[PDB]
Design a binder for this molecule. Structure first.
Ligand SMILES: [Zn+2]
Length: 324
């Protein structure tokens, strides 16, 4: 195939398989996220290892699927994920139609589901609570403080996440968006003032995950049109990204990341559109457009930042892997 041809027989990785997924009609929201996840190596490994070990679930289908790919005879090709998509439609009825879906709802549904499938599973080893391997890879923790402006009382409470969603604005960077995330907001009752009071709410990242799934919120409800729009803003993201936690732990203030996958959305609105995935594999990058698989140049990633200027090709979910 021309894919192998373009990587080169020298650069083509040992035991790697590059296989496209068939669109069954608006199922690219699923394909693209599936490819993205397949190229998160910690995740690919845990699910491959799951296949080895049991009652039919979303996870068995994923594991069958990832297994099917990583087992393929040929080096390049195309697989129809029929069983996974059926299982997904049977299991979650908000996807059981031929309308386009939100790739981020899928990702988030998939991780949540695979999470507590494995919870209910180790609740069946203990007693034939203990963080799952989904959590190990993707879980982070944020604290949302609130200060009563009257008495200055801060109330913290943590919450865990498997993905993080940030708001976008025109001509900015991921960095600018994460900073905006920790930014103060202002309807409260504090146990101290014992009245209702006015306050300042903040959100801080307490624990950084080993893989940061970063959802850019490009589908906002525009109060004008009385409809959802796709925001095609130029939002730049780096190939590498140093982030900080608010843990105060002086030995772990930090986490360094490399970009491994981008889910990009192509189009001009959340109903008319197409999803693709940009993934890193060893020294090169691949674009998966459903069945079409092809080598992309890393400089060409910047095509997916979006426009300063209707239809566009924008990064929508970024997957950053730690070097940890
Ligand atoms: Zn107060």
């Amino acid at each position: 195939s021309a894919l192998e041809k373009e990587i080169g027989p020298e650069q083509f990785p040992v035991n790697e398989h590059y296989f496209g997924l068939v669109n069954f009609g608006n199922t690219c929201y699923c394909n693209s996220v599936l490819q993205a996840l397949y190229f998160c190596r910690p995740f690919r490994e845990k699910v491959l290892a799951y296949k080895s070990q049991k009652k039919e679930s979303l996870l068995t289908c994923l594991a069958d699927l990832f297994h099917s790919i990583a087992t393929q005879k040929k080096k390049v090709g195309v697989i129809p994920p029929k069983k996974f998509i059926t299982r997904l439609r049977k299991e979650n009825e908000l996807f059981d139609n031929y309308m386009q879906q939100d790739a981020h709802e899928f990702l988030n549904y998939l991780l949540n589901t695979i999470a507590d499938i494995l919870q209910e599973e180790r609740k069946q080893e203990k007693q034939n609570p203990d963080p799952t391997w989904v959590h190990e890879i993707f879980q982070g923790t944020l604290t949302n403080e609130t200060r009563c402006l009257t008495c200055e009382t801060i109330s913290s409470k943590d919450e865990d996440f498997l993905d993080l969603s940030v708001d976008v604005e025109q001509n900015t960077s991921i960095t600018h968006c994460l900073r905006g995330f920790s930014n103060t907001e202002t309807k409260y009752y504090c146990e101290e003032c014992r009245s209702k009071q006015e306050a300042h709410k903040r959100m801080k990242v307490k624990k950084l995950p080993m893989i940061l799934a970063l959802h850019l919120k490009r589908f906002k409800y525009m109060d004008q049109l009385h409809r959802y729009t796709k925001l095609s803003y130029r939002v730049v993201f780096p190939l590498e990204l140093r982030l900080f936690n608010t843990s105060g732990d002086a030995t772990n203030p930090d986490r360094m990341y490399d970009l491994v996958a981008v889910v990009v959305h192509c189009g001009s609105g959340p109903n008319r559109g197409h999803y693709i995935a940009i993934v890193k594999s060893h020294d090169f990058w691949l674009l998966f457009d459903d069945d079409i698989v092809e080598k992309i140049d890393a400089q060409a990633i910047e095509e997916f930042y979006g426009l300063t200027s209707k239809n566009s090709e924008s990064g929508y979910i970024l997957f950053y892997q730690s070097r940890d």
